[PDB]
Design a protein around this ligand. Structure first.
Ligand SMILES: Nc1nc2c(ncn2[C@@H]2O[C@H](COP(=O)(O)OP(=O)(O)OP(=O)(O)O)[C@@H](O)[C@H]2O)c(=O)[nH]1
Ligand SMILES: Nc1nc2c(ncn2[C@@H]2O[C@H](COP(=O)(O)OP(=O)(O)OP(=O)(O)O)[C@@H](O)[C@H]2O)c(=O)[nH]1
Ligand SMILES: [Mg+2]
Ligand SMILES: [Mg+2]
Ligand SMILES: [Mg+2]
Ligand SMILES: [Mg+2]
Ligand SMILES: [Mg+2]
Ligand SMILES: [Mg+2]
Ligand SMILES: [Mg+2]
Ligand SMILES: [Mg+2]
Ligand SMILES: [Mg+2]
Ligand SMILES: [Mg+2]
Ligand SMILES: [Mg+2]
Ligand SMILES: [Mg+2]
Ligand SMILES: [Mg+2]
Ligand SMILES: [Mg+2]
Ligand SMILES: [Mg+2]
Ligand SMILES: [Mg+2]
Ligand SMILES: [Mg+2]
Ligand SMILES: [Mg+2]
Ligand SMILES: [Mg+2]
Ligand SMILES: [Mg+2]
Ligand SMILES: [Mg+2]
Ligand SMILES: [Mg+2]
Ligand SMILES: [Mg+2]
Ligand SMILES: [Mg+2]
Ligand SMILES: [Mg+2]
Ligand SMILES: [Mg+2]
Ligand SMILES: [Mg+2]
Ligand SMILES: [Mg+2]
Ligand SMILES: [Mg+2]
Ligand SMILES: [Mg+2]
Ligand SMILES: [Mg+2]
Ligand SMILES: [Mg+2]
Ligand SMILES: [Mg+2]
Ligand SMILES: [Mg+2]
Ligand SMILES: [Mg+2]
Ligand SMILES: [Mg+2]
Ligand SMILES: [Mg+2]
Ligand SMILES: [Mg+2]
Ligand SMILES: [Mg+2]
Ligand SMILES: [Mg+2]
Ligand SMILES: [Mg+2]
Ligand SMILES: [Mg+2]
Ligand SMILES: [Mg+2]
Ligand SMILES: [Mg+2]
Ligand SMILES: [Mg+2]
Lengths: 37, 401, 120, 109
RNA sequence: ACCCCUAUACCUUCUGCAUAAUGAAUUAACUAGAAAUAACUUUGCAAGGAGAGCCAAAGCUAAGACCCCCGAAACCAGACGAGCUACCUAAGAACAGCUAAAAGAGCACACCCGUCUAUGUAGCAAAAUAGUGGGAAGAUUUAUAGGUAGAGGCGACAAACCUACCGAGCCUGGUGAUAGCUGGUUGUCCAAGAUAGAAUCUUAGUUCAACUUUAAAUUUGCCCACAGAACCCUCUAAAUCCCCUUGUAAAUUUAACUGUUAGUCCAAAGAGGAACAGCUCUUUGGACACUAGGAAAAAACCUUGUAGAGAGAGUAAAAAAUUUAACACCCAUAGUAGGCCUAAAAGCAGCCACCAAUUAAGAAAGCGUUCAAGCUCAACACAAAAAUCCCAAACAUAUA
RNA sequence: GCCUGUUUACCAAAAACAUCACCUCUAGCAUCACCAGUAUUAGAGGCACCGCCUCACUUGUUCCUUAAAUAGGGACCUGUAUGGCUCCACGAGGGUUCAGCUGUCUCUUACUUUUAACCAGUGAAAUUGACCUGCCCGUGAAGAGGCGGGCAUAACACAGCAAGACGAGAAGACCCUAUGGAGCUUUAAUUUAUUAAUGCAAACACCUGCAUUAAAAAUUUCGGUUGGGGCGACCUCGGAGCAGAACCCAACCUCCGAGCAGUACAUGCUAAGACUUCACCAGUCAAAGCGAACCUCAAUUGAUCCAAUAACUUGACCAACGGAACAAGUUACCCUAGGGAUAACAGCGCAAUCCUAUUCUAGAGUCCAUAUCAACAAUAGGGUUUACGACCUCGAUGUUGGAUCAGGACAUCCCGAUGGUGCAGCCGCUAUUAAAGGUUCGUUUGUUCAACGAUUAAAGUCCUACGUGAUCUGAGUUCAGACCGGAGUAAUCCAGGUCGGUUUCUAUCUACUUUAAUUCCUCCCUGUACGAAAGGACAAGAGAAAUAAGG
């Protein structure tokens, strides 16, 4: 299989773990701003 | 793609027609013309050896010739093989050239399917050459497997492909009947515009209907789809003109008959309009070709008999002479078309007295073409001159005693 | 192609936040590393295998003392993903000849020079 | 259609990098074109290979390029160069280590 | 004892075998590494050694150690075969009955053959039985004796037949033929040990190289700081070479050898294919061809490796997550059917302008009209499916 | 094919071989064949009686035959090609056919004998790693009794069955390989030892020696790479990408080129030290010195031996280019050693091809994307086609169809329910749900298919080792025989046509062996609803049948 595939090539499990661990974590704003004056 | 062609015309105008066919390809250029006489059209070499050697030396001396277009309806396999070997270039006939332009211009799925059916004979003829690169010298010594040989398997595959194409075309014919159901039920008069290739059918339909989306091209076989466009006659009656595919002479009947699936709309037409290209030198030969093509298509005999004729392209130079581009005889032609549809669709132009109440007048407007209304207020009624079909007349008689 | 990895130098430039987190003053740096192999050299390149052998970290979870000098640091950078590096701490100072037989390397990284094995 | 291209690698290039002790006659670098130009105490063979003309240490430097006036192509390139421009090339040098010799007392006449 | 938990016979071959690849029913017995040159070790003697010959610039003498089994189709020589069969020679024999008449005549016995079917297929039979069928006074069938013998004979040529297996008989001998091919290659224990290519009638093999093993001599071996290694080309990758220190202990050389040189997947840079293949081809690296744990079972993924006993302990990798589409309500007079355009084209076929009245309305954003008309709107007002039968059971809330 | 006859004993009995007749060639002669013969003779051959000539076969159209014909027969029409037409009789030869006949079949049944089962006597064979020998799904050396997850599970005989144990049998006959064989053919290489001629010698025609020419033979070979093998292409050397930066890197990978030329005659001799195409061989650079003056080009070539030469030196497009001194074809007459390292069937990977569904809203559909479709394209799903790969199997996984029995999926052909419609009704089209049940008989052709005839409610698409040959058939394909057309000098071969051609197995194990029906049609509703007419319904009810199951 080439580096560029027409389909999403399966990642090596370690690469998958890397991508899962380095996912974007949004900032949790403690108290939800919606229900603050 | 790009092809420089030598137009080799056997002889026993046509050169101009073949040149137009070549120009239609958008990448094919005639770089030489050779009108050669012969007394034996049917032979392995169409020309006697005396002319054949001269043609061969001329063709091989000219280096710009990428191919040769032999203006013959269809050349046999031995003839093609011998000519190819002698002239060292590809050989094309009327069948192959027309088939190529059909494939190029075909855009709709229906057109592609029909041109595939038309191609089928070409594929059968070129089967040996198209599979010569797959033989691999396997057969008759491998002791296991289906008994079919290489050529037998290839022929079986070709037959299966043809069967698939024919099944798809039968489904297409059923769907075309389904589409025609509604127009038939509502009793729209249908006029099928037939004629020789490039004679102005599309231009005439554009002139009659007034539509702007219609694009009459300059190349041959521009229209490959049978399509219906509505128009209005002087009697305020709406008539549906069916633009069809043009016909060509000295061409195998099977090529055009492969379009019968979509051309069956012509059979169900109420009238047929033959667009004669009077300005063309060979208008008589074109008439013979189109009439023979229609008979081969098996159009109804009453319809072919009632066929009207219109002489288009009269500007360049018992019937109605018309000029589609200039729009000269269009009003007259519309008058004769009105008369023809009245006498063909069984529509009676009659005066009818109706009480000016109960929505009878509105019913007549919506179910018939009210030519005029003369109202008598003293009796509170109206006499309508209306073109009404038999079905509409019966409905009115029952609904409003 | 998979090749040896050149670690950018900016990786090994500690920040004040790193100093606060890990408890190490940029001035007065520690002298010795306690290095323990916490990862197998199997499925790793032969150069990493060789560097591990050179550092003498063949046995896992076996602390080894090394100099905190640029060359040893370069080797440790090469094999940094297979090892745990901590600063060797000497609360009672360097062991002397008298107490050389009573030393012990506590899990905290401190080389205590008196090991009585008695309650405090 | 494509025939040939089976030639193997010439195994050319630098044989002595900078700082390498080199004895007289050693080939420093083999090249098909003039990648590294001969410097002090470095000679060129017929096939453009650089060999050490003296025993010493190899040093690679960048030095201005001044072709021989009879090298027509290089002189034309220079003639077309804009003013202020100076060509540079990589030169290979052999810094001789040992002295040519020593004066020794041979006889106390 | 079983029930509990763990456990995919062995050998060979292979990249990889529980493999549904080979061999093996099992017991007993038999059944397969022969050796020179040069080296190595140990003695003797020593510028000499040796029991003539030979060697010698520490050699020489002696000893120790050192290289398998079965298997072809074949080829040639000499014998033996024509009691089967092919043909021929000598002298013999058989051919009912009927029709016809001196018949390579017809029907049809004996007789000879073997068309078709069934049975049989380790059979009654290494070619048969039953029925059916062809010939059956002839080029017929057959008894007896003889002849032609293999680079041959004989042949109404089917490459037929020649003593059951004739593209060339059989036996013996050369012969233990040869086989780069397959199979086999028998006590215990420990250790080192998977690694670029070149040439080759060569890619099923071999020689050299590389790798590997042993012994010996010596000193640098690996990791690697600066500095350094090209323009063509305007820009441009991971990196590489070289390399003191440093951490380490290996490296080179000498002597003597084999064996591996038909390889798999994974990550990455690419090429071919179709940006298919558990596809093929190079490069860097890893793993497997070795142990163990995990990913379900699992050669190639992850963890982990140097080996024993323990009814101790800390850990490594190691368990998937997800559930997704409501929505405005009211209201509409009108410069005029704005001009041109066209039969008319009227907000709506096209072009120009796109102002303007009513508090509030585009010279009209979509339908609809041949054209109109009628409808609104804008404006006011308030995700999937295939074939034997889904696939642990389950579980949302007890403090990492 | 003239006929009677002959033949592959043991798969082919024939159209093949022979055959009278005819034709071609050779020979003028006796004491072992021919021949105890003598040109009306003998031998070696070709073809096939006789008779007529020196027209036959191919391209299409058509007629008869059948209800239906790729079958059979007969015409005409286009081009190819002194050995072509003519069937009298005959034929276990190959096709077609009237009529009859009949269990061939619709559609099987009854009985007798053998076999069989039980009792008694006698008593094998292949086979066999050990077996304490289950099913489903998944996995895996790519198809599990043994592995993972489930399910099932007291132990045993006896009789049947043939789905599996890639079942037994033959170290696969197919295919490839081996510097393994053999048969045959040759204008393959090398010879003429042997015969027959001649010529020259020797002797005075014969014999002997030496040459030349033929016949006959003999020995030996028939390269490699290769996405299996064949065909085609290629085989050595150099430059550039792939391989961006020390070196090195494959490809039947992309492109370029070379097999010289030119100039000089110190293009002399020597000699440190280095490079090196990953070995060796070979190939490179070169200080200093003597002697002199004051080599360009990337490749531009080839070893040993052996020949020529007094010597120096020279000699192969030895291009299969590390080079055999000199050797080709064919084998289905084949053989042996192996190979699943390598092909054909199958499985498996893949999905280019193929099939299917959605998305876009161009375009058809009179207007109207969306009743039905649908271009350019996008996203998905399937594993039924044509392919590609070569992963299991070559110490055998038996092959296309058909019979028999069928298991399964639903992407439904019919029967059921429902939505839309360009649904007035009847016919329909489309879509959702539904796999309980069903899904015909015939002519031609081996046909799976296809065309045609008559039906049906329908004559569904597939998978199951292209389900099913230890249940069957062998018509084709695909052995050995033989023709016709083509290729070749021939042997022989051919993706051309055809006639004939051995179908083994007693069951050890697993598995299994007695489990509320559908549909059509007739009548009535009703000639009603609907419809202008034509035509023409549902629902409910009654009656008839057919099939299937059980008796
Ligand atoms: N001078 C002239 N030209 C005309 C006239 N009518 C038609 N033509 C041309 O004839 C050609 C025909 O174009 P179409 O009308 O599209 O052709 P068609 O008849 O549909 O035929 P196909 O192209 O075969 O489909 C075009 O070049 C027209 O312009 C006429 O009256 N006068
Ligand atoms: N070096 C070399 N040797 C040759 C050449 N030609 C022939 N030979 C030698 O001769 C052998 C070839 O023998 P042939 O082929 O018979 O030679 P030929 O010259 O063609 O013919 P004969 O003279 O009959 O041998 C080679 O192997 C060499 O031993 C050549 O061009 N060069
Ligand atoms: Mg047109
Ligand atoms: Mg190259
Ligand atoms: Mg086995
Ligand atoms: Mg095997
Ligand atoms: Mg066995
Ligand atoms: Mg006899
Ligand atoms: Mg008699
Ligand atoms: Mg007789
Ligand atoms: Mg024969
Ligand atoms: Mg034969
Ligand atoms: Mg015998
Ligand atoms: Mg042997
Ligand atoms: Mg070991
Ligand atoms: Mg341990
Ligand atoms: Mg509004
Ligand atoms: Mg006969
Ligand atoms: Mg006979
Ligand atoms: Mg005989
Ligand atoms: Mg026989
Ligand atoms: Mg016989
Ligand atoms: Mg027979
Ligand atoms: Mg004959
Ligand atoms: Mg028949
Ligand atoms: Mg008994
Ligand atoms: Mg399974
Ligand atoms: Mg039983
Ligand atoms: Mg049985
Ligand atoms: Mg088993
Ligand atoms: Mg078997
Ligand atoms: Mg075998
Ligand atoms: Mg063969
Ligand atoms: Mg041989
Ligand atoms: Mg070298
Ligand atoms: Mg070679
Ligand atoms: Mg044959
Ligand atoms: Mg064999
Ligand atoms: Mg296959
Ligand atoms: Mg394989
Ligand atoms: Mg492979
Ligand atoms: Mg077996
Ligand atoms: Mg469904
Ligand atoms: Mg057969
Ligand atoms: Mg027969
Ligand atoms: Mg046959
Ligand atoms: Mg059988």
């Amino acid at each position: 299989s080439k580096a560029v595939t027409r389909h999403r090539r399966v990642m090596h499990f370690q690469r998958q773990k890397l991508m899962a661990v380095t996912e974007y974590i949004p900032p949790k704003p403690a108290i939800h701003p919606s229900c603050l004056p | 793609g790009t092809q420089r062609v030598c137009l080799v015309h056997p002889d026993v105008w046509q050169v101009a027609e073949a040149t137009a066919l070549v120009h239609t390809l958008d990448g094919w250029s005639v770089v030489q013309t050779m009108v050669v006489s012969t007394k034996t059209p049917d032979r392995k070499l169409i020309f006697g050896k005396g002319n054949f050697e001269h043609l061969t030396e001329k063709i091989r001396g000219s280096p710009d010739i990428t191919c040769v277009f032999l203006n013959v309806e269809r050349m046999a396999a031995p003839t093609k093989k011998e000519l190819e070997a002698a002239w060292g270039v590809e050989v094309f006939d009327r069948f192959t050239v027309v088939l190529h332009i059909f494939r190029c211009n075909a855009r709709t799925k229906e057109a592609r399917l029909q041109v595939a059916l038309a191609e089928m004979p070409l594929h059968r003829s070129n089967l040996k050459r198209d599979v010569a690169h797959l033989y691999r010298g396997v057969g008759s010594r491998y002791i296991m497997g289906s008994g079919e040989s290489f050529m037998q398997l290839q022929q079986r595959l070709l037959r299966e492909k043809e069967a698939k194409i024919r099944k798809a075309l039968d489904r297409l014919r059923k769907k075309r009947h389904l589409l025609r159901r509604q127009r038939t039920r509502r009793e729209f008069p249908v006029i099928s515009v037939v004629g020789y290739t490039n004679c102005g059918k599309t231009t005439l339909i554009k002139a009659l209907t007034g539509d702007a989306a219609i694009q009459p091209r300059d190349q041959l076989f521009a229209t490959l789809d049978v399509t219906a466009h509505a128009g209005t006659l002087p009697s305020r009656m709406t008539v549906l003109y069916v633009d069809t595919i043009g016909f060509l002479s000295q061409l195998p009947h099977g090529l055009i008959e492969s379009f019968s699936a979509t051309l069956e709309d012509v059979a169900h037409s109420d009238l047929i309009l033959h667009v004669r290209d009077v300005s063309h030198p060979e208008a008589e030969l074109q008439k013979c070709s189109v009439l023979s093509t229609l008979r081969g298509l098996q159009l109804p005999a009453p319809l072919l008999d009632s066929m009207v004729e219109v002489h288009n392209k009269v500007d360049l130079v018992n019937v109605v002479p018309v000029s589609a581009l200039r729009g000269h005889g269009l009003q007259e032609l519309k008058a004769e078309l009105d008369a023809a549809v009245l006498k063909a669709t069984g529509r009676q132009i009659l005066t009818l007295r109706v009480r000016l109440a109960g929505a009878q007048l509105s019913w007549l407007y919506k179910e018939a073409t009210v030519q005029e209304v003369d109202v008598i207020p003293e009796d509170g009624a109206a006499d309508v001159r209306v073109i009404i079909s038999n079905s509409a007349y019966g409905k009115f008689r029952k609904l409003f005693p | 192609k998979f090749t040896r990895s050149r670690i950018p130098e900016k990786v090994f430039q500690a920040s004040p936040e790193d100093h606060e987190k890990y408890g190490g003053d940029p001035q007065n740096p520690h002298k010795l590393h306690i290095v323990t192999r916490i990862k197998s050299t199997r499925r790793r390149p032969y150069w990493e295998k060789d560097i591990i052998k050179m550092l003498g970290l063949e046995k896992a979870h076996t602390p080894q003392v090394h100099k905190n000098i640029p060359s040893v640091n370069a080797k440790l950078k090469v094999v940094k993903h297979l090892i745990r590096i901590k600063p060797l701490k000497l609360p009672q100072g360097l062991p002397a000849e008298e107490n050389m037989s009573n030393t012990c390397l506590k899990s905290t990284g401190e080389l205590v020079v008196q090991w009585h094995l008695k309650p405090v | 259609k494509n025939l040939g291209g089976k030639s193997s690698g010439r195994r050319q290039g630098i044989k002595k990098m900078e700082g390498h002790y080199v004895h007289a006659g050693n080939i420093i670098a083999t090249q098909r074109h003039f990648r590294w130009h001969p410097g002090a105490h470095v000679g060129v063979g017929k096939n453009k290979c650089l060999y050490a003309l003296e025993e010493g240490i190899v040093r690679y430097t960048k030095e201005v390029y001044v072709p021989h006036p009879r090298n027509t192509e290089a002189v034309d390139l220079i003639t077309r160069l804009p003013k202020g421009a100076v060509l540079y090339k990589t030169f290979v040098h052999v810094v001789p280590a040992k002295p040519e010799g020593t004066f020794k007392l041979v006889a106390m006449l």
